[PDB]
C-alpha cells in the first residue's frame, strides 16, 4: 500500500554480542517495541519499548544500548549493543509519518551461547584436486569483530584462509573460504572451523571428518631383503595397502612391465627360482578411482 520495507527476515546473535540490522523503507516519530501486542481494549500497542525517538536530549548513540541509525527518508537500520536473551523475539518498528502509521516486525533470535558455524564442502574431494572448503556463519556486527580459524586435528591449519563479511538487506553473514590441495592422507582426518572473537578464544565450531578419494597407495616387502638369492632359493614378496578410497577390487603382479600370469594375490612366492626370474617386480591394486602400484623390487639371482 503506502509502505515498503526491506530487511533480513531473521537476524541472529547471542547474549553479550551486538546485532546490526540493515533496513530500508519508503516520518514524525519512530518507536522500537519488543514483541508489540495491540490491545483492542485500550486501543494501544502494549509491551516493552526499546527505543523512543521523541525523548529530547537523547544522548549520542554509543552511550545507549538500543541505537537507531536511520533517517527520515530511506534508512531504518538498528543496533543493539549489547544484545540480550530477553531481546529475543519480535522487534516492532512503529513508524509515524504525517497521516499514516505502520508496525514493521523484524525477527531477532538470541541464543544463550554463540551458535556454531556450518561447513560446506564439495560432495567430491579427491587427491591433488584443488577444492575450496567453505565455513559459513550467519552473524556479523561492526561493534563485535570476529574471526574464523581452520584447524586440522585440533592444530591451526597451515593454509591461508580468506574472510569476507556481508551486512545487507538480503543476508547477514561472515564467510571464510580456504583453498588447499588435499592428499590421500586427509581422508579420515578431522577438519574443524572455529569461530572466535578477537582474542584466540573459543565461541563455537563446526567439524567434518574428511572423505578424500584416492588411488591405492602400496608398500612392497621382500623376504631376502638383507641377503643372497642363488638359483633354487625361495623368495617371498608381499604387497601391503596403506589406504584406498574407495575399496580396492583386485591385485596383480608385474615383472619388468609385463603382468604375471595367475599371480593375482597379495603374496608372490618364487620357490625353486632360476636366474631368469631376475628383474623388476611391482604390484598393482585397483580402485574405482584407478590403479596404484608400489615401488619396484629388483631381484638379482646369484650364480
Amino acid at each position, epitope marked *: 500500500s503506502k509502505w515498503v520495507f526491506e530487511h533480513p527476515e531473521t537476524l541472529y546473535a547471542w547474549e553479550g554480542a551486538c546485532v546490526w540490522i540493515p533496513c530500508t523503507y519508503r516520518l514524525e516519530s519512530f518507536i522500537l517495541f519488543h514483541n508489540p501486542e495491540y490491545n483492542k481494549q485500550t486501543s494501544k500497542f502494549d509491551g516493552t519499548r526499546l527505543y523512543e525517538s521523541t525523548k529530547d536530549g537523547k544522548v549520542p548513540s554509543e552511550q545507549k544500548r538500543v541505537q537507531f541509525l536511520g533517517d527520515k527518508n530511506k534508512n531504518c537500520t538498528l543496533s543493539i549493543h549489547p544484545v540480550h536473551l530477553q531481546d529475543s523475539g519480535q522487534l516492532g518498528l512503529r513508524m509515524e509519518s504525517k497521516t499514516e502509521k505502520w508496525m514493521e516486525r523484524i525477527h531477532l533470535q538470541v541464543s544463550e551461547r554463540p551458535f*556454531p558455524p556450518h561447513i560446506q564442502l564439495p*560432495p567430491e574431494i579427491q587427491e591433488s584436486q584443488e577444492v575450496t572448503l567453505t565455513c559459513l556463519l550467519q552473524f556479523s556486527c561492526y561493534g563485535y569483530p570476529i574471526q574464523l580459524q581452520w584447524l*586440522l*586435528e*585440533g*592444530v591451526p591449519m597451515r593454509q591461508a584462509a580468506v574472510t569476507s563479511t556481508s551486512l545487507t538487506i538480503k543476508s547477514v553473514f561472515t564467510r571464510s573460504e580456504l583453498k588447499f590441495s588435499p592428499q590421500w*592422507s586427509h*581422508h*579420515g*582426518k*578431522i577438519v*574443524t572451523c572455529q569461530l572466535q572473537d578477537a582474542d584466540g578464544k573459543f565461541l563455537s565450531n*563446526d*567439524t*567434518v*571428518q574428511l*572423505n578424500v578419494k584416492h588411488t591405492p597407495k602400496l*608398500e612392497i616387502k621382500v623376504t631376502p631383503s638383507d641377503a643372497i638369492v642363488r638359483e633354487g632359493d625361495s623368495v617371498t614378496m608381499t604387497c*601391503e*595397502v*596403506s*589406504s584406498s*578410497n*574407495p*575399496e580396492y577390487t583386485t591385485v596383480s603382479w608385474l615383472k619388468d612391465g609385463t603382468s604375471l600370469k595367475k599371480q593375482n594375490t*597379495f603374496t608372490l612366492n618364487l620357490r625353486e627360482v632360476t636366474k631368469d626370474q631376475s628383474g623388476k617386480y611391482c604390484c598393482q591394486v585397483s580402485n574405482d578411482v584407478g590403479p596404484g602400484r608400489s615401488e619396484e623390487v629388483f631381484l638379482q639371482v646369484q650364480y
Partner: antibody, heavy 116, light 113 residues
Framework: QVQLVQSGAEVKKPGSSVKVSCKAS????????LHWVRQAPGQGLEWIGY????????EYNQNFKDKATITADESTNTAYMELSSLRSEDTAFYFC?????????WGQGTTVTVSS | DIQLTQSPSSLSASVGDRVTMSCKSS????????????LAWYQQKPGKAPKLLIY???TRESGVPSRFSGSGSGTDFTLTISSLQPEDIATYYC????????FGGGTKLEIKR
C-alpha cells in the same frame, strides 16, 4: 553427556535379516564418521565399516561387503547397520563407535543371536 | 588390509609385577601432518565395551590410572602396566584409526599361580 545408544537384544532366524540402531546424543551427528564393530563370542574386535553421516558415504571391511549395510538418518540422529543372510557365525556383540580428535565414544553394544 | 599383530596372546603375571604387551603394525601409522601415531589402547572387561586407555599412542586419557602407559612410534608400540593390580585383569586391544579401523588380536591378562 555425549553418548551412543544402541537398540536392544535381537533374536533372528537363520536366513533372516536384522537392522541395529545407534542413536547419537550431545554432538553434531554429521560431524564425525560412525563406525560399526563386531565381536564374535570368544574373539576380538573386528571392524565392519563406517558411514559419513554428512554425505552417506560408506566404506566396509572386505569381509563384510556381502553382509553389512550401514545407513544413517540425520532427522533422527540415528545410524543403522543391517545384516543380510544370517548364519551361526553372526551371533556376536555389535558396537557403534566414533572418534573425536582426542578420544573415542562407544555405544553400549547390541547382541544379535541367530536361532530358530 | 592393515593388520596388527599383538603379542603375546595371553600374559600371566603376579600381583605387583610390571607387565608389558606389544602391538606391531604391518604398515606405519605415523601421520605426516601432526607427527602423531594413530594407535590407541583399550581395556575390555567381559560383556562390556572396551574402555579407552591411550590415544595417539602415548597420551593417557582422563582419569586413567598412572600405572598404564603407552609408548612406541611408527610400527612398534608397547603398553606398560607398572604395578599389576587385581582390577587390571582384562583383555587389551590396540587400534589404528587413520582412515579405516583395524584391531589387534587382543592380549588376555590373567593371574599366574
Amino acid at each position: 553427556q555425549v553418548q551412543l545408544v544402541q537398540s536392544g537384544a535381537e533374536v533372528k532366524k537363520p536366513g533372516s535379516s536384522v537392522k541395529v540402531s545407534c542413536k547419537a546424543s550431545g554432538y553434531t551427528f554429521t560431524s564425525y564418521w560412525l563406525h560399526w564393530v563386531r565381536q564374535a563370542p570368544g574373539q576380538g574386535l573386528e571392524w565392519i565399516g563406517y558411514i559419513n553421516p554428512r554425505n552417506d558415504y560408506t566404506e566396509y571391511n572386505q569381509n563384510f561387503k556381502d553382509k553389512a549395510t550401514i545407513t544413517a538418518d540425520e532427522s533422527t540422529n540415528t545410524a543403522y547397520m543391517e545384516l543380510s543372510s544370517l548364519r551361526s557365525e553372526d551371533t556376536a556383540f555389535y558396537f557403534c563407535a566414533r572418534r573425536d580428535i582426542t578420544t573415542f565414544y562407544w555405544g553400549q553394544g547390541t547382541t544379535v543371536t541367530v536361532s530358530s | 588390509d592393515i593388520q596388527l599383530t599383538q603379542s603375546p596372546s595371553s600374559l600371566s603375571a603376579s600381583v605387583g609385577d610390571r607387565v608389558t604387551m606389544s602391538c606391531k603394525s604391518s604398515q606405519s601409522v605415523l601421520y605426516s601432518a601432526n607427527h602423531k601415531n594413530y594407535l590407541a589402547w583399550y581395556q575390555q572387561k567381559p560383556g562390556k565395551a572396551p574402555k579407552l586407555l591411550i590415544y595417539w599412542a602415548s597420551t593417557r586419557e582422563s582419569g586413567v590410572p598412572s600405572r598404564f602407559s603407552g609408548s612406541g612410534s611408527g610400527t612398534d608400540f608397547t603398553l606398560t602396566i607398572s604395578s599389576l593390580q587385581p582390577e587390571d585383569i582384562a583383555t587389551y586391544y590396540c587400534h589404528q584409526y587413520l582412515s579405516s579401523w583395524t584391531f589387534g588380536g587382543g592380549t588376555k591378562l590373567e593371574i599366574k599361580r
